[PDB]
Design a protein around this ligand. Structure first.
Ligand SMILES: [Ca+2]
Ligand SMILES: [Ca+2]
Ligand SMILES: [Ca+2]
Lengths: 145, 145, 145
């Protein structure tokens, strides 16, 4: 009806106001349909995954250059490396998203992936490039929604 | 129409992104259809009620074990007791929600309600159990929306 | 349909919960259909405009007494003056919103606008009244959404 068109407009406006506020305050970065955010904590991979799922999201993983740059800006902001949502396959060198699917977009630092002790996790340097490492380090927790 | 199904999906996604961000940042706890949040202030009952209504919510009151535990986690988090949304009836011993209705779910500390000077308000200990007290103490303000 | 009426209700509830949380935490002030918010930064006019647009909003401009008072409360809160969304016309004395339209609601401090060196920008004193000044000062950035 006509009353429906009105309600949707207000609802859309309100969402746009709340997201604008969170953005202005630096609580989140929006890229396309994805929203990235961090709780400022620096913990290991398992802990990050838990924190994000508990917040109703998932450990962040860039799938485009723009997404990768948004996460990179957060890592730079906190002067810390970020663990990404991906892990090495059974056969070293290959990586897959946490759902199993194989990674498509990649931004490895030159020479990487270079598995010392079978580097299973992936960290993002502050310049945005990736390094495959182990998963017990303390890294900035960044989630995507 | 079909364009309507699309709009609703995006709107639902966005809300889920903003709530995810607030959750990740510890600004609010969601339990079922209820959201709890605190402004970190420790003031008396009247002041808490005003703050919550002014924010478009109400002084929190647990109606299920899960809700009670969520509030308890916030009280523990701030290492302070929380005033709950309920007050003693005209006849001591009985308590009612702020709308008048009688309390159903209760989690009194053993021995409570124990009205010294006609304990009218109800505070939540950090372990989640309740104690009926007076209303002039300074307690953590927790609201529900 | 009937399932639509239900979805809208939940969506409206959720938005009301997120806005309630932001309000309680002092992250934003709602006035009618307008939301004001600040990132706590004190920068010049050009910088403020950029910050707000980047957040999906615009440098704040009061169009009613109530809106003016809400912004005034924020300026008082941070003990700093706020640059408003308006600039002086080609012919001194006249001011227009950033879209070109001429200002309607005004709250000039007695004697203002008083253009010393052709005061082009407008700042809000902590009492809510306005003073036309230059645009290079460092003022609290307040956006509207
Ligand atoms: Ca490596
Ligand atoms: Ca007692
Ligand atoms: Ca002047």
């Amino acid at each position: 009806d006509e009353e429906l068109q009105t309600e949707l407009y207000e609802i859309k406006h309100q969402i746009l106001q709340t997201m604008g506020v969170l953005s202005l305050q630096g609580s989140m970065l929006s890229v396309g349909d994805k929203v990235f955010s961090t709780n400022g904590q620096s913990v290991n991979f398992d802990t990050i995954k838990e924190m994000c799922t508990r917040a109703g999201g998932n450990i962040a993983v860039p799938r485009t250059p723009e997404e990768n740059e948004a996460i990179a800006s957060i890592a730079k902001k906190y002067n810390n490396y970020v663990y990404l949502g991906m892990i090495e396959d059974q056969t070293p060198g290959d990586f897959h998203y946490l759902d199993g699917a194989s990674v498509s977009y990649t931004n490895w630092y030159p020479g990487e992936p270079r598995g010392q002790g079978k580097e299973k996790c992936v960290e993002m340097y502050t310049d945005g490039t990736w390094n495959d490492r182990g998963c017990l380090q303390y890294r900035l927790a960044v989630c995507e929604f």
